[model samples]
Target chain A: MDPLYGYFASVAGQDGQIDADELQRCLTQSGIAGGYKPFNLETCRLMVSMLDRDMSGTMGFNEFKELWAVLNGWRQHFISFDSDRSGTVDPQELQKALTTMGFRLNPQTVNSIAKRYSTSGKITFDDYIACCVKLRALTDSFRRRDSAQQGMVNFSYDDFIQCVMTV
Target chain B: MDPLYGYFASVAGQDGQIDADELQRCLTQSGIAGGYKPFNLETCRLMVSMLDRDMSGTMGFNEFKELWAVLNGWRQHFISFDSDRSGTVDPQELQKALTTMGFRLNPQTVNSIAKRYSTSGKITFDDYIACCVKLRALTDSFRRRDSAQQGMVNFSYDDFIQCVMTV
Candidate 1:
């Protein structure tokens, strides 16, 4: 079973409206918020809003599954670049990935992604989640990795490669 | 006669390297820095390096042109969301846009993008630039909104709408 499925199953009893407060509590309890600054109310609200697809205000099992898939796809994308799945991408790995995609990492790119997503110079799962959320907003693509197919919720390496090439 | 070409020509000398120090001095002298946070060494470095793709330690005019096109495309996308061109999008507009795309604006989504790009609740042209840089880092194609191959290099509304509808 996917870890996200387990996570959703654990939280299934909550009402369809998973408020920001609840998400913070869950994240804190899950140990995902370690060493990172606490998520503000706005961040929490945004997370809930993004995950609550049906407008029920709360995440159900299916919604959570989709959220998990999206978030996990980002994590995997970063990990593929990291090459070691070490939960942290060093500058070299980041540079190499960008170079492969015909781009390079500048200070702003490094600082911004690191400050928000990387924990101690390494990206955590939470960082991956944050990256996906922000990327989705900027690209205006709610779907993970732009696969555009209903059943394809997660991002495969091909999808990730295609995205970078298109850019 | 393209606006971007005109802007570039106005700024660039025969060498093609836009005078980095001169531009910074201009911004500083004009009091642009006074109205905002002082540009630290890192911020200054980021701005100059971005403008000077060759400063990547290794990049060419073609790469630089592509980067410019990518950044300009994102600027248009951000403006599209802002709708009124006020440089700031209200929650309602954001919600309506995301909802129509089958996604919701969660707290994390709003806070991350706003914090990363917006200044004083306003998303400036610089914010749009930063948004695109980070967005390209995270996703696949930054050129999705570039529907037309016009040498002018601005994103078209139809291209953006089509991309979002598919999302």
Candidate 2:
């Protein structure tokens, strides 16, 4: 029986803060990341940074709560694509998922993603989460440049690649 | 007796389709726009055109179904703000509603919208739906220019006003 420490405390460091590594463990152990392998450490760092107000290197309980809500929303959305309960999505399902998120990529680009992320032609739960996060970051990058909130932007080739690669 | 005619038929025209006027009547009579007064004829025309895939200036059953789904979604969203069951939202509610829809505006802007749309300082359901539709159209206009989905755009001031006016 784990006593004296709540779930958050159990996962948090001695300082009562959750760093990216600890956050990853909490996400995986708590089954909030859909009970998969969890997002990579780098992704966890970005997530922690997103909610880590006050420029703190670690997340307080409040930040953790916000992150939990967002991650749960992602979980629910993932379950939408996991209609078969196979804990994964095939290339077609991946395409539908992307379309649901307002990204209507060509089939060729979708296939490339599938080829890279899919295991045996099906993307696991963790991989799908990673893909959506990356897509959101890239789309946000474009949106920031679109001060007028118009759906079009002009980008130099190098700048475009830099934006894509940095993310 | 309103028999031998389904809800769609009852709302449709002699031509077996729904025009803007009939659409407005249907929206109110069916209680789909939250049972308030119907959207104005001009707004109804825009709604019909949105779902009129064939551009026939009228909606068939298929198009009606699509529009019903969209209207129902809006109805549910409106009810989220009608906490007191008064069938209307006050100024604060309107602010929350816009924030929920991802438009975080200044208090002054919210107050201006409140001043313009509120009836006795509350926005009726029909009016709320219309406002949402207009907001969506304007945002969509911006999105169309943001072909890259970067969330930013550059527009000449004249062209910007032109875009806004056309919408």
Candidate 3:
């Protein structure tokens, strides 16, 4: 039998698709998840939503690719901001990251975002992605600025001031 | 008009929405694009397709939010593989990245994927996303293994051998 087939068979655990419980178990055992934070079912649901393209409430092989990319995506973004390489970003760093990404956030807003989404007053890569995705203002601002995907396009000082004031 | 509405309206140019040409210009003149092959139009169309939601020829602000996520997703994935903090990933790093993501590839296959996707024998972050997304076996394997967002997963020695041998 194929290794992937067998692996999926083990992972899926029944009905030919992996569900929330099974996914949580695999994540916990895999050591990729679990810390002081542990596995979050809410976050898991969001993950599934992003990857479960067909809205099956579960994942198929095709959907799994997006999930992997999502993880990689979050991981990389976290890595970029965690320049200290501590596997996490400090509040100051995340604020800097948002700034670099073209958002002109006030210090108060930055702390608010971090505090609202962060479990320990600081966020890991996963937490960061979760936080940013849910913040409509941040996402919208990003959408407006980088619509072209050039990796943090330049904005004028005046543009930055205007953005900061509005947000 | 709302700032966002005004912004997108200005960005829309000829159409009531943000079309490909307008997008390309926003991408280029805004300096979000350039260098590394200099704004390939084919790539721009592919991007529009992802965010266009309704598959409408252009994007509205609502559609643009998802587009922002898409860009962030790709950007993060690219950053992860660029381990040296360099703007690109060499064959070795790219191969390591693929392996970490759960693909089992032989030396030849690693080189093969890199050569096929990269220019000058290395790949940029964008190229890597395009590359992984386009690969069937690789994508299928990822889809099979982590069908649910279980984060990292475990694989048996036998499973590893089997996957490596087949690929």
* lDDT for A35 (candidate 2): 55
What order do candidates take by TM-score, descending? 2, 1, 3
**Candidate 2 lDDT by residue in tens digits, A60-94:** 77667767776777778778988888788887887
Worst 10 residues of 3 chain B by lDDT: B158-167
Segments in model 3 whose C-alpha atoms lie over 4 Å from true places: A1-7, A28-38, A53-55, A83-87, A98-111, A132-167, B1-167
Place model 1 in a CAPRI quality band.
Answer: incorrect
Residue runs of model 2 more than 4 Å from their true location after superposition: A1-167, B1-5, B11-17, B49-57, B102-111, B156-162
| Candidate 1 ranges with C-alpha deviation above 4 Å | A1-22, A33-87, A91-126, A132-167, B1-167
* Residue range with the least summed lDDT across 10 consecutive positions in model 1 chain A: A158-167
DockQ-based CAPRI category assigned to the predicted complex of candidate 3: incorrect
Instruction: Give the RMSD in angstroms, all C-alphas superposed, for model 2.
Output: 23.2
Each candidate: chain B TM-score? 0.42, 0.71, 0.52
Tens-place lDDT digits, model 1, residues A44-156: 54565666443334555565556545544544556577555445666445444434433233444544444333334565544445444544443443234345444223333
Interface C-alpha root-mean-square deviation of candidate 1? 15.0
Per-residue C-alpha lDDT of model 2 across residues B1-167, encoded as one tens digit per residue: 33213677887877789777777777667766554555777577667655553445577777677677777877786777776767888867787777676654555555555544555557787767666665565565566677886755565433432343223
Per-candidate local distance difference test: 0.42, 0.63, 0.51
